[PDB]
Design a protein around this nucleic acid. Structure first.
Lengths: 102, 88, 76, 62, 44
RNA sequence: GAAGUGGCAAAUACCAUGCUUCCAGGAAAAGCUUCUAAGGCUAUAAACGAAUCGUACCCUAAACCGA
RNA sequence: GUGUCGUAAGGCAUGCUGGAGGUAUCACAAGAGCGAAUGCUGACGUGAGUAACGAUAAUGCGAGUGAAAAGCUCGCACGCCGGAAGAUCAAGGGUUCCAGUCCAACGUUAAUCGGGGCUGGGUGAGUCGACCCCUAAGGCGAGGCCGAAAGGCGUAGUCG
RNA sequence: CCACUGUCGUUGAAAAGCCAGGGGAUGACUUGUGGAUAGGGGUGAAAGGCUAAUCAAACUCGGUGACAGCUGGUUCUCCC
RNA sequence: GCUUCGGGGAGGCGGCAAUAUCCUGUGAUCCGGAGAUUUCUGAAUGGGGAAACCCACUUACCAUAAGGUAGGUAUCUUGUACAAGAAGCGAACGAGGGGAAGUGAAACAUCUCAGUACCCUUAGGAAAAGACAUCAAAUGAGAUUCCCCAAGUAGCGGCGAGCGAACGGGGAGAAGCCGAUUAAUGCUAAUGUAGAAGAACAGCGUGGGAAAGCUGACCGUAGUAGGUGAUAGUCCUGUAUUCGAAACAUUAGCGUUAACAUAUUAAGUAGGGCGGGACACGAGAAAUCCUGUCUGAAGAUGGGGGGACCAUCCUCCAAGGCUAAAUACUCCUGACUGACCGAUAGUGAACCAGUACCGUGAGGGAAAGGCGAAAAGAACCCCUGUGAGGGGAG
């Protein structure tokens, strides 16, 4: 839940360790990041729908603990904490530095 | 009441018997509410298709078929259908 | 049932005991009888299914004192 | 949706509920005959009827 | 040859059915026992 | 675009819940017709109705009772 | 599997398989050791490719379809029932009814066929039956009677 | 509706049948539907018959893990 | 699934099980409190009935046709033809009314089993009991209940098999009263029912993948948690720690209200005869308690008990009612645990199980878990009947 759709993350575990990307989908404990963890799907063709078929290369879900949010300044893997702004706003901040943005 | 006649007619029947009856004797076949009487079917049809007059309502209950799926034995809903004759 | 109205005497359980000490379940029944009691204060006879112990109680206490207790206790 | 329904009179809530039941019948006929592409109007209409009956009960109770 | 079952719905529902069970203290104990075991079929 | 009416035979079905006999002496209650008790009805029609449930199919059987 | 070690129960090492756990030592506790109990459960043998394929009313052939036809469809012929092996129900069953489609399993063989799979369809009543009104046997039974309790009986009635 | 004889069948087509014969067939008959009688109880033109393929005491559950001076079985090793 | 009050913050329209149309920062899905709706059957309650159906009567209103909306209509009990209750279901534990046999006695009848199983009635969070007409016999104690002893003792017993105390001691808990009752209502405090934050790891080699190896760091009121592609205090969820409630529940304290109760010292009673039962105690020399039957006092100058009975002495006042705790239990809720099992085990049931199946019925009653880290679940080609099955490819 600490990583949302749209934020850039760094892969810290698995075959695609060290690659960056934008989060496409977050399930309960699994995350999908564009450009990383790409599988080959043998899509069986069908006329009922508009998809042609063939051999496809699509990104697969991986465990959410294998990715970390990417620090926008230090360009390194970082953790996420929360800040209770007295103005009444709960924003994610980076654990290392601590700035509001993402 | 008028809020009961809206729920009487559940949908037209589209089959060869239906099409033949509509072509030849001009009768409408409807799926109707399982608790609906012939008088309510008359009132519902005349209310919801303005400009038509019902001559006769013939109704029947048809039992749902036992259709299995996977490891289960289910069955379809029962339903009631009406044959409605109209003043041509 | 076979219960005295005024005393609550009901069948009691026990044993038939033989000379060889064989024991068989038995009952002891109340000495219940149907009796019409004259009530002066109501100018009427009231018929009660009563034991003889209850009849002696009516002798000693009076029919009114027992009838009021029956009515308080219930069935009347 | 419920915002522009809570400030409606009892009479016009009844009059709108009747129209919604008529619309439910029309949706049923169109879905049975195949003239209902967006197949979520039936769900939304049924939920709106439930809302209208809830509000009618509230306004008839208090 | 003639066999033992020889079915009849009126007889079945009148000797074993829900109302015949409910009409006696011991039939209600039958039903309570069936419910405690959790049977999907209470009565014939 | 045709015919379609005569003879004869003939049920265990119908007349007949009859008739005749016998002793072993042959349901009940309602509908119905009348009479009143306490306290609308009969003819004439005219218009309009008669709800609900079953109805498929097997049934001397491959579908019921016999695994 | 192999080698090796111990009097034995057994130990150790290692090839292959396997793919995520194991356990020295000394104590401690046991659901602690299986060939038998006509033991229990599952699997799989022998018998054996043996008996049988369920009324001895009976089939032949030509076409068609099909991957394939003795069995399906059509045709010709033949045979059987015909107080039924024909027809209408009730009871009971519950979709087995009809069409299209499929043949794995089911059908004691094959199956293109089917009461099999799948997907659609099909049952229309004032007069037929039920419901309904009435009651039989027999139930239940305001009150009532009886009975340790539970209950048993029974009147008016109410069902059947 | 029965069940006298025989053959067959006896891992049956069938947990009582088939075939050829046999008996009653207006009666103390046969049969449909509903109802009543319930276990030391019922019912029995009486065979201890029958009471759901169960009967000199039904079935199910419980007492219950009945008891069994009886039969069976009783599992690693070595030393005295 | 509708409304609302809170929480929460980016996904979501429950599972097999996806697809489609879509919803969602104008805050969805989701979680918690409250409310609305809540078909029919079933105590089923308007009458009936083969449960999920048939048939009604009536009041008010609406419609004008053959109906609709909102109600009322069971029975029994208690109150003045009217109001309030009850009913049925459901674990064990309590109290009560009835009450076996198998078995043991190496047979069997007394006896045992056992006041058990079972049937039946009926409560409460417990119940029952309970304040001396009790024990004791010591220098006396001081209600009831439960535990450890006393003690397998004293006894009972075809003196067999067996059964089996009490006094008193050490403890738990303690309480005595004359309403120690029930049910609402309002304040006060606390709790519960959603939540929030929550530290600290990099490099190198191996490897499909690192959490394991080597080197060097850091947090710790957080280091033996579950996961993550192999074994993680520093990757995630967490943990230590610190914390939130609009609403409703519950617990306690105070106040008020309304229902019931509020004895005044106890006669058909104590005692007795007969027949039984209970007492460890089987009639026994049998006290004591209960009572079916038949009787029947004294009544404080009196009466009960102290194990036949009498005297003396001691003790206590029945025939009015109540009373917390310590004790019993688990259908269940929360937390936590296990030298408990790990798919023939553990529940019968890890899985669509009280199911399939068997039985008229009561009832009996199974089998059946695991691809992979991720479906990346094998596009396409070939043989085949567009089948199965396979071989390539991936």
């Amino acid at each position: 839940s600490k990583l949302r759709k749209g934020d850039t993350v760094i892969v810290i575990a698995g075959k695609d360790k060290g690659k960056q990307g934008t989060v496409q989908a977050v399930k309960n404990d699994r995350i999908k990041v564009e450009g990383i963890n790409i599988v080959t799907k043998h899509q069986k063709p069908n006329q009922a729908t508009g998809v042609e078929g063939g051999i496809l290369k699509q990104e697969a879900f991986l465990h959410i603990s294998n990715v970390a949010i990417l620090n926008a300044q230090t360009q390194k893997a970082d953790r996420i904490t929360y800040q209770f702004g007295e103005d009444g706003k709960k924003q994610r901040v980076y654990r290392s530095n601590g700035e509001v943005v993402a | 009441n008028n809020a009961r006649l809206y729920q009487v007619l559940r949908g037209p029947v589209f089959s060869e018997k239906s099409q033949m009856l509509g072509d030849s004797l001009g009768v409408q076949v409807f799926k109707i509410d399982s608790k609906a009487t012939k008088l309510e079917v008359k009132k519902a049809v005349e209310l919801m298709f303005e400009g038509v007059e019902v001559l006769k309502v013939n109704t029947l209950n048809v039992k749902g078929k036992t259709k299995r799926f996977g490891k289960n034995i289910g069955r379809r809903n029962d339903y009631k259908k009406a044959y409605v004759t109209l003043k041509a | 049932s076979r219960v005295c109205q005024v005393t609550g005497k009901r069948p009691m359980v026990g044993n038939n005991v033989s000379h060889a000490n064989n024991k068989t379940r038995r009952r002891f029944l109340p000495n219940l009888h149907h009796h019409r009691f004259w009530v002066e204060s109501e100018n009427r006879f009231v018929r009660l299914r009563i034991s003889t112990k209850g009849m002696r109680i009516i002798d000693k206490l009076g029919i009114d004192k027992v009838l009021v207790d029956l009515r308080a206790q219930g069935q009347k | 949706k419920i915002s522009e329904l809570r400030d409606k009179s009892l009479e016009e809530l009844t009059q709108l509920l009747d129209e919604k039941q008529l619309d439910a019948f029309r949706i049923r006929m169109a879905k049975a005959t195949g003239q209902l592409g967006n197949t979520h109007e039936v769900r939304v209409n049924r939920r709106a009827i439930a809302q209208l009956q809830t509000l009618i009960n509230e306004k008839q109770r208090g | 040859m003639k066999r033992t079952f020889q079915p009849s719905v009126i007889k079945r529902k009148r000797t074993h059915g829900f109302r015949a069970r409910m009409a006696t203290k011991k039939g209600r104990q039958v039903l309570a026992r069936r419910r405690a075991k959790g049977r999907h079929r209470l009565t014939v």
